[PDB]
Enzyme design. Structure first.
Site, PDB file in Angstrom:
ATOM      1  N   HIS D  98       0.737  -1.258   0.000  1.00 55.65           N
ATOM      2  CA  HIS D  98       0.000   0.000   0.000  1.00 55.65           C
ATOM      3  C   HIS D  98       0.776   1.325   0.000  1.00 55.65           C
ATOM      4  O   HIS D  98       0.195   2.379  -0.285  1.00 55.65           O
ATOM      5  CB  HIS D  98      -1.088  -0.007   1.098  1.00 55.65           C
ATOM      6  CG  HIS D  98      -2.422   0.498   0.619  1.00 55.65           C
ATOM      7  ND1 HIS D  98      -3.615   0.126   1.196  1.00 55.65           N
ATOM      8  CD2 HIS D  98      -2.745   1.346  -0.389  1.00 55.65           C
ATOM      9  CE1 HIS D  98      -4.615   0.721   0.570  1.00 55.65           C
ATOM     10  NE2 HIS D  98      -4.115   1.467  -0.395  1.00 55.65           N
ATOM     11  N   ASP D 121     -10.221  -1.021   2.578  1.00 55.31           N
ATOM     12  CA  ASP D 121      -9.160  -1.649   3.353  1.00 55.31           C
ATOM     13  C   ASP D 121      -9.616  -2.102   4.736  1.00 55.31           C
ATOM     14  O   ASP D 121     -10.615  -1.608   5.268  1.00 55.31           O
ATOM     15  CB  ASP D 121      -8.121  -0.543   3.575  1.00 55.31           C
ATOM     16  CG  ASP D 121      -6.689  -1.040   3.663  1.00 55.31           C
ATOM     17  OD1 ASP D 121      -6.402  -2.082   4.291  1.00 55.31           O
ATOM     18  OD2 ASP D 121      -5.832  -0.313   3.123  1.00 55.31           O
ATOM     19  N   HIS D 123      -7.490  -1.680   7.135  1.00 52.73           N
ATOM     20  CA  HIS D 123      -6.737  -0.680   7.887  1.00 52.73           C
ATOM     21  C   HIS D 123      -7.031   0.743   7.436  1.00 52.73           C
ATOM     22  O   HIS D 123      -7.636   0.959   6.392  1.00 52.73           O
ATOM     23  CB  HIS D 123      -5.239  -0.959   7.733  1.00 52.73           C
ATOM     24  CG  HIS D 123      -4.871  -2.397   7.934  1.00 52.73           C
ATOM     25  ND1 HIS D 123      -4.804  -3.294   6.893  1.00 52.73           N
ATOM     26  CD2 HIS D 123      -4.585  -3.100   9.055  1.00 52.73           C
ATOM     27  CE1 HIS D 123      -4.495  -4.489   7.363  1.00 52.73           C
ATOM     28  NE2 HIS D 123      -4.356  -4.399   8.673  1.00 52.73           N
ATOM     29  N   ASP D 125      -4.398   3.161   7.374  1.00 55.66           N
ATOM     30  CA  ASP D 125      -3.185   3.630   6.717  1.00 55.66           C
ATOM     31  C   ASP D 125      -2.949   5.118   6.941  1.00 55.66           C
ATOM     32  O   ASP D 125      -2.456   5.831   6.050  1.00 55.66           O
ATOM     33  CB  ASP D 125      -3.228   3.305   5.220  1.00 55.66           C
ATOM     34  CG  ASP D 125      -3.140   1.822   4.951  1.00 55.66           C
ATOM     35  OD1 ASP D 125      -2.598   1.110   5.816  1.00 55.66           O
ATOM     36  OD2 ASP D 125      -3.627   1.365   3.888  1.00 55.66           O
ATOM     37  N   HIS D 138       3.731   1.227   4.615  1.00 55.33           N
ATOM     38  CA  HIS D 138       2.473   0.868   3.965  1.00 55.33           C
ATOM     39  C   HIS D 138       1.309   1.190   4.900  1.00 55.33           C
ATOM     40  O   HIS D 138       0.148   1.068   4.527  1.00 55.33           O
ATOM     41  CB  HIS D 138       2.457  -0.605   3.527  1.00 55.33           C
ATOM     42  CG  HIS D 138       2.234  -1.574   4.644  1.00 55.33           C
ATOM     43  ND1 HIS D 138       1.622  -2.790   4.453  1.00 55.33           N
ATOM     44  CD2 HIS D 138       2.515  -1.500   5.966  1.00 55.33           C
ATOM     45  CE1 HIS D 138       1.531  -3.422   5.607  1.00 55.33           C
ATOM     46  NE2 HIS D 138       2.065  -2.660   6.541  1.00 55.33           N
ATOM     47  N   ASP D 225      -7.296  -2.195  -1.350  1.00 57.24           N
ATOM     48  CA  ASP D 225      -6.362  -3.096  -0.682  1.00 57.24           C
ATOM     49  C   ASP D 225      -7.093  -4.428  -0.552  1.00 57.24           C
ATOM     50  O   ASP D 225      -8.108  -4.515   0.125  1.00 57.24           O
ATOM     51  CB  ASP D 225      -6.053  -2.548   0.720  1.00 57.24           C
ATOM     52  CG  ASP D 225      -5.098  -3.419   1.514  1.00 57.24           C
ATOM     53  OD1 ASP D 225      -4.870  -4.590   1.161  1.00 57.24           O
ATOM     54  OD2 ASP D 225      -4.563  -2.914   2.510  1.00 57.24           O
ATOM     55  N   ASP D 227      -6.685  -6.839   1.285  1.00 56.47           N
ATOM     56  CA  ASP D 227      -6.898  -7.309   2.662  1.00 56.47           C
ATOM     57  C   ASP D 227      -8.181  -6.755   3.268  1.00 56.47           C
ATOM     58  O   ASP D 227      -8.496  -7.015   4.428  1.00 56.47           O
ATOM     59  CB  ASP D 227      -5.666  -7.121   3.590  1.00 56.47           C
ATOM     60  CG  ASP D 227      -5.419  -5.659   4.036  1.00 56.47           C
ATOM     61  OD1 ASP D 227      -6.363  -4.863   4.153  1.00 56.47           O
ATOM     62  OD2 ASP D 227      -4.247  -5.320   4.318  1.00 56.47           O
ATOM     63  N   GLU D 270      -1.486  -4.935  -2.247  1.00 62.48           N
ATOM     64  CA  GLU D 270      -1.262  -5.983  -1.256  1.00 62.48           C
ATOM     65  C   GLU D 270      -1.395  -7.444  -1.669  1.00 62.48           C
ATOM     66  O   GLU D 270      -1.464  -8.331  -0.810  1.00 62.48           O
ATOM     67  CB  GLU D 270      -2.094  -5.690   0.007  1.00 62.48           C
ATOM     68  CG  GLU D 270      -1.689  -4.398   0.717  1.00 62.48           C
ATOM     69  CD  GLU D 270      -0.432  -4.570   1.562  1.00 62.48           C
ATOM     70  OE1 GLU D 270      -0.224  -5.677   2.102  1.00 62.48           O
ATOM     71  OE2 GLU D 270       0.345  -3.604   1.710  1.00 62.48           O
TER      72      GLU D 270
HETATM   73  N1  LIG Z   1      -1.162  -1.295   5.735  1.00 59.34           N
HETATM   74  C1  LIG Z   1      -1.196  -2.050   7.034  1.00 59.34           C
HETATM   75  C2  LIG Z   1      -0.843  -1.185   8.257  1.00 59.34           C
HETATM   76  C3  LIG Z   1      -1.043  -1.944   9.583  1.00 59.34           C
HETATM   77  C4  LIG Z   1      -0.730  -1.138  10.854  1.00 59.34           C
HETATM   78  N2  LIG Z   1      -1.746  -0.063  11.055  1.00 59.34           N
HETATM   79  C5  LIG Z   1       0.676  -0.536  10.766  1.00 59.34           C
HETATM   80  O1  LIG Z   1       0.791   0.683  10.490  1.00 59.34           O
HETATM   81  O2  LIG Z   1       1.646  -1.284  10.999  1.00 59.34           O
HETATM   82 MN   LIG Z   2      -3.752  -0.661   3.148  1.00 59.35          MN
HETATM   83 MN   LIG Z   3      -4.750  -3.264   4.703  1.00 60.33          MN
END
Ligand SMILES: NCCC[C@H](N)C(=O)O
Ligand SMILES: [Mn+2]
Ligand SMILES: [Mn+2]
Ligand SMILES: NCCC[C@H](N)C(=O)O
Ligand SMILES: NCCC[C@H](N)C(=O)O
Ligand SMILES: NCCC[C@H](N)C(=O)O
Ligand SMILES: NCCC[C@H](N)C(=O)O
Ligand SMILES: NCCC[C@H](N)C(=O)O
Ligand SMILES: [Mn+2]
Ligand SMILES: [Mn+2]
Ligand SMILES: [Mn+2]
Ligand SMILES: [Mn+2]
Ligand SMILES: [Mn+2]
Ligand SMILES: [Mn+2]
Ligand SMILES: [Mn+2]
Ligand SMILES: [Mn+2]
Ligand SMILES: [Mn+2]
Ligand SMILES: [Mn+2]
Lengths: 298, 298, 298, 298, 298, 298
Positions: D98, D121, D123, D125, D138, D225, D227, D270
């Site tokens: 990402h 997503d 998440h 991000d 990412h 994404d 995921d 991803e």
């Molecule tokens: N793109 C996944 C990110 C997952 C988590 N919030 C991190 O910043 O590690």
């Molecule tokens: Mn992401």
């Molecule tokens: Mn994600």
């Protein structure tokens, strides 16, 4: 409100062994850590001592298997739960088969003018020695708590009934014995079988459920049976039934209850590690407990 | 109304062998027991004798594989089904690939002024020898029944068409050939692809479907193809397509139809034990049949 | 000879929780029934009480995690096992992680002039606080029993060592730490890694092992770690290692030992229901026990 | 509008290797063929050259791992994307983790008065070096694009911010860090976590999303994404989170976006072949792209 | 020698339905094509008509379930097989449960001075009405063919016994009833249970088997029960037993028999499509048939 | 001796895309780390640049698909490998489909008076344009190396043949084309199909193989095709064939070769991440390489 965990290693309410390992399976799935993160004053009062059941032979009722051991364990549970409530704490009971609901409700109900119950399950658990096709007490706790059944079960805590039929809401039901369909119909118990869940959607079922109870109870007990979820989501249960609630539907439900702030006590039952796939079921239970207690995605 | 089961061990409508074992797999899955429990007078008239197809090269049309054997078997089916209707019973046809719909509708339609059809499938089955990309007759029964295609298929039972386009509702569609997309658009056939099911919800799709047909038909035939369900739910099918209807959506649909009391005949097709996971698909078919015929959770 | 079952619900020898449920998972897997059928006078002495470990930071050695609790529990085990041997019975110990071997051998060894040991495992379990890469005591029972390690472990039962290196045979090894490879080489311990099993065959490995020990010991203790089997056969273990012994190889081994009549005591360890697939591993353990105790196909 | 494919073999945005194979996995999953069938003028501009990141200990980047390599690869991507837009083509970026969103939005945003963003997503991000719990870039592309973070990331393309918070809509979120929850809360970013998806339904979420952005943007970039889908549907992802969007929900979303005709650029990220089950995830991506670009069931 | 296939759709020898679909499951798995490739003059004489069994109630022996239907079907089978042998062809019988061995041996044995038998199975099939724990005739064919049992079964073909105990070799046995262990022991039947297979290896077992029979018979009948293989290799069997022969061991066996040129007749039984995973078991049977008939890797 | 890794991202030798990702899948599976631990001076020379093959219809190559691109990539590989050997390093080639063996042997053979070859595979790879049933060049490298086939393939490196038939040993073969069976037969190539592996055992096969080549060669090249292992052990391969070598048999083989110290060069081919289960196959390859290079359990 601070929480008090009480494990009830019970399997005498049914025949598949291993459900007595549910309390530790959930502890191992991280129930304390999960709740502590939500800033709770969580306390673990250990497990209720359960006595081994007399063998069927010299035992009395085959329609009421292990009645004395089940009745005695529930007596102890009722006492433990009663004291927790008296101490101003929230009783979180971890089972153990569903027959423990008899002791949990026996210790909680005496503390409410009108205690409501949300029975999240694939079954109705409203059988009696007369209607039970198995003699398994785990299939009778709701009826016994409504005042219907063998006195050894209905009188736990020295009073009955623990709740009124009009204060009960069944959710996720998809496997009722004929006697139970009749009992539900006649006692006028509110019920959302999978048909209503599929037809109305979990959101509407929960909205209607919460509004209904909130309008006529002063406390609500969540009796969550893991077999209420689909065996694919919760494989570790003794009496699984296909076509159940999903993982997401279960979280939404818990989330919506958290929001409603109506749940005053709860118990997660039927987790059997010995029939599961790598503690998956205990895990689901712990995650659901997190949501119930206010854990949120945002 | 009493029910009459007719097995049609047909696989000549397509190329995957084994779909001819569908009738017995469903019998073994317990269809009689299931229906008897609902207090029905169920009767099993056995199976329609299906001949073997002649040498491919000495056959007439490549775009109409096994036309002779498929057309003749459907003739026999039509007669059997006709007889059952005349006797005042409900024809429940067990297949067998979807090409048997041609025979089923041929024996049923003649008895209704305006027979409607609910085609539960991942496909439209509205191809002709011209539009068919396979030459597989199991991909042509709906068009043929609508009067479109080779006379060997359109004239089964000595009449045509069996139904009108405006009396047809397609549900669960997610795999249509270009020719078929054009056919559906031009014949003005009502259709709910997975998009509509996803967007509106099975409940709305069924409400709308039942209301539509009920308002303009005098009998409704349910042609349920098991591949209408996701391959995860119904793995035992010859031409699976991902992203299909779930087990629960299928039960709700059957449950809402039973409620509507509009289904006058039915057939469950494409069950192939040889491509299945321990008779799972035959099992799903039997359960959905129970719901169709009024089985309820409460 | 009558058998006495002693469960040791231990998980303090390592970090994966759940291995403490091994004794009951095996009981639930049917160990009593299995052995009674072979006409044995079997007796279940219950479980050894295991205390809970003290705060990690206020513990003595990081290289010896939970030393206090592990050492004390092993003391209790040694006593229980000692008693059983004195009574003229066969001690069958059910674990519980492999650190319990320390207690088992402590109660058994004192009764033999030259007790031999067959260590069926994927690991050597010959680490010390110095060589251990984990600090997990379940990786030190064999060395400790050989008199190598912390006195808290080497002096269990008030004597040491329990056995001599020349009386030990390792089978199924495929995961040794460097320190352990050196230990085995230098103490001159007999070992059949997977290479030898693959190269010679289980039959030859067992023939050679039985002949070796029989020629220089007066009793043989079988310490069978379930992770000695491939994770596909025995998924429920805390520290699995791929490319292990099969189900059949394990039965042949037990069958050839029964035949030899050299096993005087045994223990089945590392069964973890919480990491298993429906009690599969506890089941394998129970079946292998049946073979060990003379169960035959013909 | 003609499409231009740009592969970005990036894995420096996180730690799981293999996600750099995502572009070719999707090409092999048939992205070109899929889009050509919808009669598009599809062109593949190959891949952006990504330089290996220097040792974490040698170059200063831990709360910002691989910053140099990630910042420069995104510079190149920004240019490539900028040129595609200039040529009047739709930029379809295939990742890659990402963090590549930083370059994509950097090349697209300069061309719009008010570019909106749909972030599909699990998440958010929206982490910064300060709030990041992993140091994985990412997990910072959206915040960086909103103008929050290290200048090496916020200044890609010579300008910032690329977008405004009120023009962003998050969908499918179920795993947010505390700092992120606060960021979303305070920046006032519109978000539909799984609770809203479960409560309102994907149709509602998409209707509200499309109407919101359509009312206040002049272009909308889809940052999908994989995921965001459940790990059962999209297994090949580095940071999976259970209880995600289904295959069908994703197709409906894409179908409704196609319909709205609001998506002016997109990127599918991803996809990691090395953590997948037979290219399943790349396949879902390709399919989802087909829908986005107008593929229909009927 | 030319081959003649005779399908025996029998399931009356046991209780799991579906084993009657074995003949067509194997035909569909391509048995004809497979053998034709080996340049054989293969002929398919269709299936033996099996009559539905009288219901248990008015039926005679519960120790001999469906005796008349089973006995009659075997009469027809014996006749069909007798004629094939008379025509100078090799009888290849496809089942169907193991009770059909009664008819196959009844039609073959009369043609040999000393017919030997290789019983490849997990069971001994040497039970009588007295020793049978199930009353299932599929568990009695070998004893009945040895002249032990109900006359209705022992006299099929008008003669008995069909074979001598000293001319029988059992391979892969791992599940014998007590009466059967006694029968085997006393009649002096040669037997290689899984212990011997594990101990000696399939090669030595086959070498010894082939030499033994070749030294005292004038024809050898291969009665191959698919449950002789491990349920993981052959899942589609009604009475599976774990810890069986592998796919490779089975091919080696067939290959070694092909080489020996001693097999004068054969039958592959117990294939049940309704309990299988996508016709896997029929497939294994067809592959094994190929090896038996001389198919080679080089 | 120091090792030099050369990746050959080749898939033009067959039709399944993705096998070009084999080199990076194995690098990601940890090939460098694995070998460094055995204290080797390991060096990664990157990958051989492979040019995209022109349309089959445009350039003449169907019994020899992609001949130009395959021939030239192998020219480059031959040079790279030749140089590594010259530098006194061991060439470890990571594929890539099996057609790359043509280049590897082309760069190694010139350095040996009598180079032997162990071809670990399910196939023989001895087809020619005339005998090839697919036109896939990955099915011709061994014949081409023996000097049989198109000059574009037989003359790589400016010489031929690279090896003699009497110096080749095939192991694990279970799928040979007719032309190939004849080739092997007539050229007198030593071969151990699965029958010999099942009959003699891997130990015996390896003992005989090592002794054979050791007695008549001055260097031995290991050409290991992952599809030589069973598809359950090595799922990520383009042309899998059931009933293959196990994980353990492969480790024993590698272990015994390490011991013999006869392997002077090697290549691990056919790893396709896009058809695998979470890089399982690349992983097996890496593990097998560890053993080959002397990794030991003890
Ligand atoms: N793109 C996944 C990110 C997952 C988590 N919030 C991190 O910043 O590690
Ligand atoms: Mn992401
Ligand atoms: Mn994600
Ligand atoms: N707690 C499950 C009850 C199951 C069943 N309805 C019974 O009464 O046996
Ligand atoms: N019954 C499935 C039909 C498949 C396709 N529409 C065809 O006509 O070949
Ligand atoms: N019981 C497994 C032992 C694992 C490892 N040798 C250790 O000592 O940590
Ligand atoms: N053909 C299988 C026989 C099974 C069992 N030994 C019985 O006699 O019932
Ligand atoms: N390397 C696989 C080759 C397979 C087959 N013999 C062919 O030549 O197509
Ligand atoms: Mn319940
Ligand atoms: Mn329940
Ligand atoms: Mn259809
Ligand atoms: Mn269909
Ligand atoms: Mn151990
Ligand atoms: Mn171990
Ligand atoms: Mn049998
Ligand atoms: Mn059998
Ligand atoms: Mn090859
Ligand atoms: Mn190969």
């Amino acid at each position: 409100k601070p929480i008090s965990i009480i494990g009830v290693p019970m399997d005498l309410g049914q025949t598949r062994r291993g459900v007595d390992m549910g309390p530790s399976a959930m502890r191992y799935a991280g129930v304390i850590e999960r709740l502590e993160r939500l800033h709770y004053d969580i306390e673990d009062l250990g497990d209720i001592p359960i006595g081994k059941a007399e063998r069927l032979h010299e035992q009395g009722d085959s329609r009421l298997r292990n009645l004395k051991a089940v009745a005695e364990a529930n007596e102890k549970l009722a006492a433990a739960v009663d004291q927790v409530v008296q101490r101003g704490r929230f009783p979180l009971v971890l089972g153990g088969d569903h027959s423990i609901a008899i002791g949990t409700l026996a210790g909680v109900a005496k503390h409410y003018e009108r205690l409501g119950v949300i029975w999240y399950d694939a079954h109705g658990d409203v059988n009696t020695a007369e209607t039970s096709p198995s003699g398994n007490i785990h299939g009778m706790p709701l009826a016994a708590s409504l005042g219907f059944g063998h006195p050894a079960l209905t009188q736990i805590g020295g009073y009955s009934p623990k709740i009124k039929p009009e204060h009960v809401v069944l959710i996720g039901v998809r496997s009722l014995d004929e006697g139970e369909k009749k009992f539900i119909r006649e006692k006028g118990i509110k019920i959302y079988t999978m048909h209503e869940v599929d037809r109305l959607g979990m959101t509407r079922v929960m909205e209607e459920t919460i509004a209904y109870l909130k309008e006529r109870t002063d406390g609500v007990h969540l009796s969550l049976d893991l077999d209420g979820l689909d065996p694919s989501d919760a494989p570790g249960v003794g009496t699984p039934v296909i076509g159940g609630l999903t993982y997401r539907e279960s979280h939404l439900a818990m989330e919506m209850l958290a929001e409603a702030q109506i749940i005053t006590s709860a118990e997660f039952v039927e987790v059997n590690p010995i029939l599961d796939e790598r503690n998956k079921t205990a895990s689901v239970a712990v995650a659901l407990m997190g949501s119930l207690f206010g854990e949120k995605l945002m």
